[PDB]
């Protein structure tokens, strides 16, 4: 143990345990930090691999055409989709007596996309030659990449194309859209944006792209990268390392909070086109690799709970259907409040009320 | 007391958050004051009311080169800006002082909504790359 | 020309295919702008919503609301879309401004 | 003493406050989370950041 | 693991 007898080391936080899982119950100290890794199969219009037929094509919409008469309408498995992954959290000790509780929050993504590698395969045995008697056109055109990670899911809106195309409703799990969401039949007011359009995701194989953009209206706590680069055959750069470490921190100076301890990931991915030697062709997208890292920060509670678990019970607060005591038709006619005791004032008729600034005036009787 | 109680880093708090009716309200002499505002491109089409030609919003009608000297482009034809006007509250009540108050904006934070929904490769008359093949994208 | 200079009063009126900003006049506005051209060229959007764009001068200074009125301005054609019948048309997004106010004494 | 704070727990019943969706299986079997690795205090170098116990 | 405790019925 003798410092001047044997050489010393750099200082470098300990780990404590490698793993899967199921162990993120581990109890840990006051500073700890966390590192989560996810990845996120793209769901492409073909949600699973598991079906007998269609599971030929995985990570791939099947062969879309223009129609070539209005109105379109695509199939269920034409359109691409999202990917949103709620990875589980452990609850976390609070302080009753100073209203403090700690909750999750991210700090830094790292984020890669696994399988780039498997772009050039030009000798794929339908895809279609760009010169004759040579080889093949590889995924290129159409690149689409837009992930996001946030403590609550994205805020997300309505942005059709084209208002007068419909689209195959829900029967059992279906993909969602505008007139889904609101229910009555979509105006051409959402070709651009409207703010009566807003919505969660929920479901991970059933939001299109499509029609739904992430809105940065209300996405205080889910920070989002995207890019976009559209064409016929234009070529698709993407770089990948392991060393470029996004540091998410805000202006205030704190991250997402993972409120409801739930880090909601969100992914979609599209690279390419691979062209079929028929002339059909298909969107082809990527998974990707994240590395999301945790922090146990400290907030204040802004909610009182005394004055919030009382209006959850019904035995500890009645509602009863009474007549009705507030809104436009309010029966209760006049109330006034006494506090403290001044001088006798001029007439028992007069009115008081606080002003927008929050002093009392005595208003003046005018002739009506 | 700070004894025993965990530390909180202190962050700009709430005070009103809402719609546009609420822009009028007083505070005190420091304020971040953020306006979420959004505008769609007036051009082209000014407006989705009249039905039997609001067929395309933000669009303009087919650009065609004419051919013949001179040309004439109709309003639907070509396209323009789209301008807008926050109002804002009064500041200075006697504007005898000598010191005025007023106010000035420091950070635009900017983002084009809808940027994903251009990549609708199927449509019901786009113009295909080739035989058989999909539609181009916009481009 | 030197003698012609409009303002921008009307919304959707003021064609952008003849019309484009002045920077001897706009001393308090800021604008900032793109363009990229060709038949069948690619368009690249990044977006995010952490790219936080200061406005401060040289001199620490913002665009002060002359009248109490903060202008806000913008147009962004994004790109043709082609049509089966041959023809062509520009089709355009709408933004999102964020747009953060301070006091100040004057 | 109590096993769970009172604070949090009550967060959840509030669906405007606590979400929850569907997505893909973060949990149970054959899920899609790999490594998760937990690092609390500090010590000496080790030979890897990669030891296999 | 929070989202376990609701089985509310």
Redesign the interface.
């Known amino acids: 143990p003798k410092p001047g007898c044997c050489p010393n ?13 199921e ?4 109890v ?2 006051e ?11 793209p769901r492409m219009g073909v949600n699973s691999p598991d079906l007998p037929t269609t599971s030929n094509w995985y990570t791939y919409t099947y062969d ?9 309408q ?1 199939i269920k498995e ?1 359109l691409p989709a999202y ?14 007596t ?6 999750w929050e991210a700090i830094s993504v790292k984020t890669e996309v696994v399988g780039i590698s498997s772009l050039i395969n030009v000798h794929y045995w339908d895809m279609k030659r760009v010169h004759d008697y040579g080889a093949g056109i590889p995924v290129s055109g ?1 690149n ?1 990449h ?1 992930f996001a990670i946030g403590g ?2 994205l805020d997300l ?1 309505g ?7 419909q689209y195959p409703k829900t029967t059992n799990g279906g993909p969602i859209t505008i007139e889904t969401v609101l229910g009555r039949k979509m ?3 959402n ?3 409207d703010p009566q359009a807003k919505a ?5 194989g059933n939001y299109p ?9 209300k ?1 205080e706590n889910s ?10 055959q ?1 070529p698709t750069v993407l770089q990948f390392s392991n060393t470029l470490t996004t540091v ?1 921190l ?5 991250g997402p909070l993972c ?4 880090l ?1 990931i969100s992914c979609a991915d ?1 690279v390419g ?1 691979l ?1 079929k030697t ?4 298909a ?1 082809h997208g990527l998974p990707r690799y994240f590395n999301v890292t945790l922090r146990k920060r ?4 802004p ?1 009182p ?1 005394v004055n ?2 009382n209006s ?1 019970f019904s035995n500890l607060m009645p509602k009863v259907s009474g007549q009705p005591m507030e809104g436009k038709d309010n029966q209760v006619e006049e109330v006034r409040i006494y506090e403290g005791s001044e001088q006798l004032p001029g007439d028992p008729d007069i009115v008081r009320f606080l002003d ?2 929050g002093q009392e005036k005595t208003v003046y009787p005018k002739p009506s």
Do not use: H
């Open positions: 080391v750099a200082s470098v936080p300990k780990l404590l345990v490698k793993g899967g899982v162990v993120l119950s581990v840990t100290g500073d700890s930090i966390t590192q989560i890794e996810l990845y996120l199969n879309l055409q223009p129609k070539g008469s209005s109105p379109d695509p034409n990917s949103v992954a709620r990875v589980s959290l452990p609850m976390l000790n609070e302080d009753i100073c209203d403090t509780l700690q909750m159409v689409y837009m609550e899911p809106q942005l059709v194309l084209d208002y007068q195309t105006t051409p007011k070709q651009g944006l969660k995701l929920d479901k991970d792209i499509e029609v739904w953009c992430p809105d940065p209206s996405n920070r989002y990268y995207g890019s976009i680069q559209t064409g016929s234009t998410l805000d202006e205030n100076g704190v409120k409801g301890d739930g909601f599209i086109f062209f028929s002339g059909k062709m969107l400290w907030v204040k509670n909610y709970v919030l678990i959850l927008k600034f």
